[model samples]
Target: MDPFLVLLHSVSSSLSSSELTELKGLCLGRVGKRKLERVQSGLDLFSMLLEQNDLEPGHTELLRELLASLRRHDLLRRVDDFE
Candidate 1:
């Protein structure tokens, strides 16, 4: 399993059912070809976050950058269209 999936699974018990379903979809959606390309770029942003090593700042910047890039690229369109 991917490291992120492992982390997500470890935390699954704490989430509500709806939250878990959302997380499941998001995670699975992220593993495909086009999505995974974007995800790899996002992971690069995440690596920058880890380099900062500060929780709030790192997470904030990471999420902002990743989401912005994903949105700009229409990275979620495939799965969204499928739905």
Candidate 2:
């Protein structure tokens, strides 16, 4: 789990903020592979908000939290299947 988080932080820091705006398009509609690749990088940062320690949250649940940060209620409901 810690390793997973490490990757997220590493990618996020190096990532361009310009792509953050792309998250809007991702929520309202669908995203390209590039968008997905970028967002998928957050499995750890998302999970950082949740700590099961020994039992890490699944990637889907972590992703839901990330989208929720953007107030994407629609996407949150959509990712319910992940948990």
Candidate 3:
């Protein structure tokens, strides 16, 4: 299967609803507010980032930093493992 989705799913699944909202809001610069409104979960946000070329298959520094900003060191570690 796809490793990208696998990694993304692992990270995204751990996010709380509020955390996902914070994450979407933090991405206001890279993605339009309207687009983020459609994001219902961490999966959706990660997909959008992937579409915008902000995320790639193996390089996930952006995701790691974002997770760090959210203080989700656990998820940051997950992304680090993927990288």
Candidate 4:
């Protein structure tokens, strides 16, 4: 859970405001409606994310990779913008 927070904060720092919001929405989407039906705001979704007991262990790794992928994509997009 904490590792995920570390990774999340790491990602959050570098993202544009739109990227961060879209990323959160994308996360909520991928996790499914059943998983998110009770969560209304970003804070609620984030608080739930920190609860590792409710999630499978594989999701932690999935989250890390997801952030890494987003980072790489953001980097590549920026590079493209300059070309």
* Candidate with better lDDT, 1 vs 4: 4
Quality of model 4 by C-alpha lDDT:
0.48
The sequence of per-residue lDDT tens digits that candidate 2 reaches over residues 4-51 is: 454445444443343355443553443334334444434432443335
lDDT tens digits, residues 6-37, model 4?
Answer: 43444444555544455466766576556567
The predicted structure with the larger lDDT, 1 or 2, is 2
lDDT of each: 0.35, 0.44, 0.76, 0.48
Pairs in steric clash, model 3: none
In candidate 1 the C-alpha lDDT for residue 68 amounts to 42
Q: Which of the two, 3 or 4, has more lDDT?
A: 3
Among these predictions, the greatest TM-score belongs to 3
TM-score of each: 0.24, 0.33, 0.82, 0.38
Residue-level lDDT tens digits of model 1 in 19-39: 324433554544233433443
Candidate 1 structure, TM-score to reference: 0.24
Using lDDT as the yardstick, the better of models 1 and 3 is 3
Model 3: lDDT equals: 0.76
Q: On residues 11-74, what C-alpha lDDT tens digit does candidate 3 reach at each position?
A: 7778878667677778787567887778888888777777865677877677777788888778
Pick by TM-score: 1 or 4, better one? 4
Query: Model 2: what TM-score?
Result: 0.33
